[PDB]
């Protein structure tokens, strides 16, 4: 029933966990507790097999643990800065090589999978800091320049015309801009990891930088030069919608150091580089 | 099914491309690869005819390549400037001889066709620059003066009454103004090109300037003179809706120089005037 | 037009809201989806897979594979203690295991835990060990006798290399906090020599043991939260 399924959505009871059944004392040459991890399989033994359990009706649901839920929360992926210091023409516009690798929090979650396919919801939070007192009338322009399209080199470059590229104009005082993006890859899924190169020589590039080009996000303060200088910081937030992930992997155990690469750094005392806390000894809880 | 067609719109699978079928080795006196370009026709040979192909189910769609899509993106066509410098009465209003010829990006796309018929969506992005600090309360008036209607000559001209002409009043702080326009020509389609004159003498005008008169866009700062001077720049954006185009033509290969004319300039080294990049020789990729 | 009443919350941006928004790439048709082995639809799938516990993560062992093994050997005193750790799915040393890492992305947990142990000694090495779970409301057992009174499994080493001890969900409340909180500390798992580690002559006098963990059919996580098992103290650059 499309209506019964609706209720499960509102109550978040789409994926229920099984009940625990009453079990009894046993004496048998069938020993569930014994197995062989060498097989590479996980022993599927349940509590009813190792102790005498009572009957319990489970009410927990796995909804929130779904991939859609795990990767469906908007997190910051970039903090763009336009700081008017001493030259409006040079400082009133900028560009960013788009990627989901600069902020650790959302990066780590996506990287818990090898491949992921999803649509995106981008939400922007612009904030104008009044360095000299007033902010006047601030209007911003954000333009997506796909790889190949001309990148503006001045605040009045013809590229800002955006005759084809998508641009979003935001006016200070209006609500936060937001839009959706369809799955953008030329492949069937995004590579979270890529053990390959863009060539076969000692100078070929390695990693996702080869497969994850997303273009450039160009932005400028549309408003022409004003007496009082401002510093506009636009924070970009990303969220995955209609998600699918494949081949789960170990979580990032050390701090990230660069984009598109798994490189890391180690100190002379490695226990400081991982979340593992040194134990006094084997028997000290 | 008006509902099945709906799904195709949401998924953008209205225009699907054909599949590639498995082909086999051949020996025949029917030679598809041979033809005669002199005929003026393009050889309709497909991959299955020149190599042994496998069967492949195509999933690409031509939706985005439609004329509606190609010309249906809002681009800048004008940047109106009202700059209060030393005389509010003279500098608080202006006028523009409307045309889609001043900005190269959208102009080039329309000019890839000889004739085009479409409705228009105009969106305005006004931005008030605080030259002295404050911007007070800025209210703008944009009035469309069709050819023949009286053009205001002062900020208080009776024409601003707009008793018949359409006017749009925008208040700073409110969302960007926008409105639609129906196909405006006295002909069945707009001329992107016109090999004709408005007379038969050495002094008759040539080109689209003869057929594309669209009137004047007059604008003024409604707000009366304020202590602090501002500079209001209103950028006009245009988009075609419900579009039809006829007789495709070669894309503009050199920079535009003027409106309503195909005139161009050449330097002493023409390779610098076109996108063609000089090749070292015939065999250097 | 239709009269409307703008409600509180309007215009706000809540990172967990679920609204619709116009598409910046109209008419764009995404690449056909192809079959890829290994699709995951729910994190519970990952919680049900065994992963090794860095149970022997003493300062001198961290950064070495030995942090994952526990050494066994012939004893001179009976019923000696082998290891002891908290059961709390997100406490140390369970924290960095896959289920511990995933648990650290949520605030609440519930369900039974599955601890497995694989004997790494020679085929001629015998041993009987007692694995015990001590429900809360009491300190960790100070002896095998004290531990044995709780939930336990006596493991006999033989052809089947691995044994499993299930830590049943025994709690007052339906859920517990994943972060180390007094009220919801779930108890301990201790390991003791039931008999002894015995070998024939000319056989190594010590042997390793590997420890695994995963969740049972009733395991469940709740209330998504950011993890404290990973951080960023500077800019991640190109």
């Amino acid at each position: 029933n499309p209506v019964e399924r609706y209720v499960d959505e509102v109550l978040n009871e789409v994926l229920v966990v099984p009940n625990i059944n009453q079990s009894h004392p046993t004496t048998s040459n069938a020993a569930p507790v014994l197995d062989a991890a060498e097989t590479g399989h996980t022993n599927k033994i349940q509590p009813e097999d190792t102790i005498e359990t009572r009957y319990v009706q489970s009410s927990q649901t796995l909804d929130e643990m779904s991939v859609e839920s795990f990767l469906g929360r908007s997190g910051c992926i970039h903090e763009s800065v336009l700081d008017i210091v001493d030259n409006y023409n040079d400082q009133s516009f900028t560009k960013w090589n788009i990627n989901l690798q600069e902020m650790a929090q959302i990066r780590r979650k996506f990287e818990m999978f090898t491949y992921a396919r999803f649509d995106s919801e981008i939400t922007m939070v612009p904030s104008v800091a009044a360095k000299d007192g007033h902010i006047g009338h601030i209007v911003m322009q954000y333009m997506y320049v796909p790889p190949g399209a001309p990148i503006p080199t001045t605040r009045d470059d013809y590229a800002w015309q955006s005759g084809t590229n998508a641009s979003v104009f935001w006016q200070h005082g209006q609500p936060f801009p937001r839009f959706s993006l369809p799955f953008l890859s030329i492949a069937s899924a995004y590579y979270m990891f890529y053990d390959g190169y863009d060539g076969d020589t000692y100078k070929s590039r390695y990693g996702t930088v080869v497969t994850n080009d997303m273009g450039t996000l160009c932005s400028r303060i549309v408003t022409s030069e004003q007496l009082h200088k401002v510093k506009v910081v636009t924070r970009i937030y990303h969220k995955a919608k209609h998600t699918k992930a494949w081949c789960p992997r170990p979580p990032r155990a050390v701090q990230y150091s660069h984009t598109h690469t798994t490189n890391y750094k180690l100190s002379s005392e490695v226990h400081n580089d991982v979340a593992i806390r040194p134990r006094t000894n084997l028997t000290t809880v | 099914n008006p509902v099945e067609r709906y799904v195709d719109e949401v998924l953008n699978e209205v225009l699907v491309v054909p599949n590639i079928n498995q082909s086999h080795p051949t020996t025949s006196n029917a030679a598809p690869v041979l033809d005669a370009a002199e005929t003026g026709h393009t050889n309709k040979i497909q991959p299955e005819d020149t190599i042994e192909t496998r069967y492949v189910q195509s999933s690409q769609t031509l939706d985005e390549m439609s004329v509606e899509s190609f010309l249906g993106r809002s681009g800048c066509i004008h940047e109106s400037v009202l700059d209060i410098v030393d005389n509010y009465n003279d500098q608080s209003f202006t006028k523009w001889n409307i045309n889609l010829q001043e900005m190269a990006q959208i102009r080039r796309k329309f000019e890839m066709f000889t004739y085009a018929r479409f409705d228009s969506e105009i969106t305005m992005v006004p931005s008030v620059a605080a030259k002295d600090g404050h911007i007070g309360h800025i209210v703008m008036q944009y009035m469309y003066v069709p050819p023949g209607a009286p053009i205001p000559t002062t900020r208080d001209d009776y024409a601003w009454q707009s008793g018949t002409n359409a006017s749009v009043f925008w208040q700073h702080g409110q969302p960007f103004p926008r409105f639609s326009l129906p196909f405006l020509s006295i002909a069945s389609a707009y001329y992107m090109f016109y090999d004709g004159y408005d007379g038969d003498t050495y002094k008759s005008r040539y080109g689209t300037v003869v057929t594309n008169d669209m009137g004047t866009l007059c604008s003024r700062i409604v707000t009366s003179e304020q202590l602090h001077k501002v500079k209001v720049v209103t950028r006009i954006y245009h988009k075609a809706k419900h579009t039809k185009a006829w007789c495709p033509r070669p894309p503009r290969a050199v920079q535009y120089s003027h409106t309503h004319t195909t005139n161009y300039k050449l330097s002493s080294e023409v390779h610098n005037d076109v996108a063609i990049r000089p090749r070292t020789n015939l065999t250097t990729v | 037009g239709l009269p409307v009443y703008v409600t509180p919350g309007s215009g706000q941006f809540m990172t967990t809201d679920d609204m619709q928004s116009p598409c910046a790439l109209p008419w764009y048709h995404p690449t056909k989806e192809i079959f890829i082995p290994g699709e995951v639809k729910n994190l519970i799938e990952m919680c049900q897979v065994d992963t090794l516990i860095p149970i022997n993560s003493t300062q001198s062992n961290i950064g070495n594979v030995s942090m994952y093994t526990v050494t066994l050997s012939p004893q001179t005193k009976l019923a000696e203690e082998i290891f002891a750790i908290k059961v709390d799915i997100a406490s140390h040393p369970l924290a960095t295991t896959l289920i511990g890492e995933i648990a650290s992305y949520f605030t609440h947990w519930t369900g039974s835990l599955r601890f497995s142990f694989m004997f790494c000694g020679t085929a001629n090495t015998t041993l009987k060990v007692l694995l015990a779970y001590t429900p809360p409301g009491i300190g960790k057992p100070r002896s095998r006798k004290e531990a044995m009174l709780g939930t336990h499994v006596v493991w006999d080493v033989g052809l089947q290399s691995t044994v499993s001890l299930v830590v049943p969900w025994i709690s007052a409340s339906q859920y517990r906090f994943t972060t180390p909180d007094t009220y919801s500390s779930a108890g301990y798992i201790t390991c003791w020599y039931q008999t002894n580690f015995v070998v024939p002559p000319n056989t190594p006098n010590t042997a390793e043991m590997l420890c695994f963990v995963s969740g049972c059919k009733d395991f469940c996580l709740r209330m998504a939260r950011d993890t404290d098992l990973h951080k960023q103290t500077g800019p991640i650059t190109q």
């Binding site: 499309p2 994926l15 369809p182 | 709906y6 | 928004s21 598409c23 790439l25 109209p26």
Partner: peptide
């Protein structure tokens, strides 16, 4: 663009924009 259900409990799954990318979070399983 509404997937109107009935039961009376009439569900109204509405898609405001004509792109699949535009809709909210997906359903489970």
């Amino acid at each position: 663009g509404a997937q109107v259900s009935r039961q009376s409990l009439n569900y109204f799954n509405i898609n405001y924009f004509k792109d699949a990318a535009s809709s909210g979070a997906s359903r489970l399983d």
